[PDB]
């Protein structure tokens, strides 16, 4: 069938000091895909990791093609945009909706950790939504393998986004990968339920973080969060990563299992 390999770039999804992401529409089928375009003037690694991803809550990678210095990565298109845009500033969103998004985020993280990959930059701006509002973890530009041949590798690279980063990355030379992503998911949960981030960074020098450690939950954003999810956040946002709740136990949490949301 002629022309089936032609795609028109019709809209800029994102542009930044890293390249751009365009919505591409197939000339013949009208199928929509996102195309990440990068001027190679790192890539090999993101591609390698993207090839391993096959799960309903992680953006699928279709393949790539290069022409000289430009690489074109074809990725599953999420027409609903960023989860960040469903969060109302200083309000959050309805708790049942947050719970459903949180269940999908955990499914995607469990999947990644199961294949030994840590994302390292989980935040609402990197969690996309498809046309049925299904969450999809995206942008594996900072991702890395933390388990290979059944052997865990401790991480030491400081990366991520400060408000979402776990305390051990700012205080320890090496740390386990999984609790770091779990922490980030807790901050995303806070944002979805309060419409605001709890601190600029989790350091003792940050007053908001000291208050949390001092359990002053009468202050924002905690005072906007119901007791059930707040009890889960008390288990996730724990400073010692060895004492922090693991995903298998988050799955047993009371709020996590409470019926709240009707099906579509």
């Amino acid at each position: 069938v002629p022309f089936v390999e032609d795609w028109d770039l019709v809209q800029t999804l994102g542009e930044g000091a890293y390249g751009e992401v365009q919505l591409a529409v197939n000339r013949v089928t009208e199928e929509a895909v996102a195309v990440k375009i990068v001027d190679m003037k790192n890539i090999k690694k993101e591609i390698c990791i993207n090839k391993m991803l096959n799960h309903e809550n992680v953006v699928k990678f279709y393949g790539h093609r290069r022409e000289g210095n430009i690489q074109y990565l074809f990725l599953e298109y999420c027409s609903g945009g960023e989860l960040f845009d469903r969060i109302e500033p200083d309000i959050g969103m309805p708790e049942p909706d947050a719970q459903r998004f949180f269940h999908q985020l955990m499914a995607g993280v469990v999947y990644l950790h199961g294949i030994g990959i840590t994302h390292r930059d989980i935040k609402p701006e990197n969690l996309l939504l498809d046309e049925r509002d299904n969450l999809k973890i995206s942008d594996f530009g900072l991702a890395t393998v933390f388990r290979y041949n059944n052997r865990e590798r401790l991480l030491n690279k400081m990366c991520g986004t400060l408000p979402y980063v776990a305390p051990e990355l700012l205080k320890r030379r090496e740390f386990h990968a999984e609790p770091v992503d779990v922490w980030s998911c807790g901050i995303v949960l806070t944002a979805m339920l309060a419409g605001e981030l709890p601190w600029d960074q989790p350091s003792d020098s940050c007053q908001e973080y000291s208050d949390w450690k001092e359990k002053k939950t009468y202050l924002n954003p905690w005072k906007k969060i119901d007791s059930a999810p707040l009890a889960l956040l008390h288990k996730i946002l724990v400073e010692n990563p060895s004492a922090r709740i693991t995903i298998p136990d988050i799955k047993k949490d009371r709020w996590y299992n409470k019926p709240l949301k009707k099906g579509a």
């Binding site: 089936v4 390999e5 795609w7 028109d8 770039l9 195309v35 093609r65 074809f74």
Partner: peptide, 5 residues
């Protein structure tokens, strides 16, 4: 603007 697959 276009690209091939």
């Amino acid at each position: 603007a276009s690209v091939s697959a």
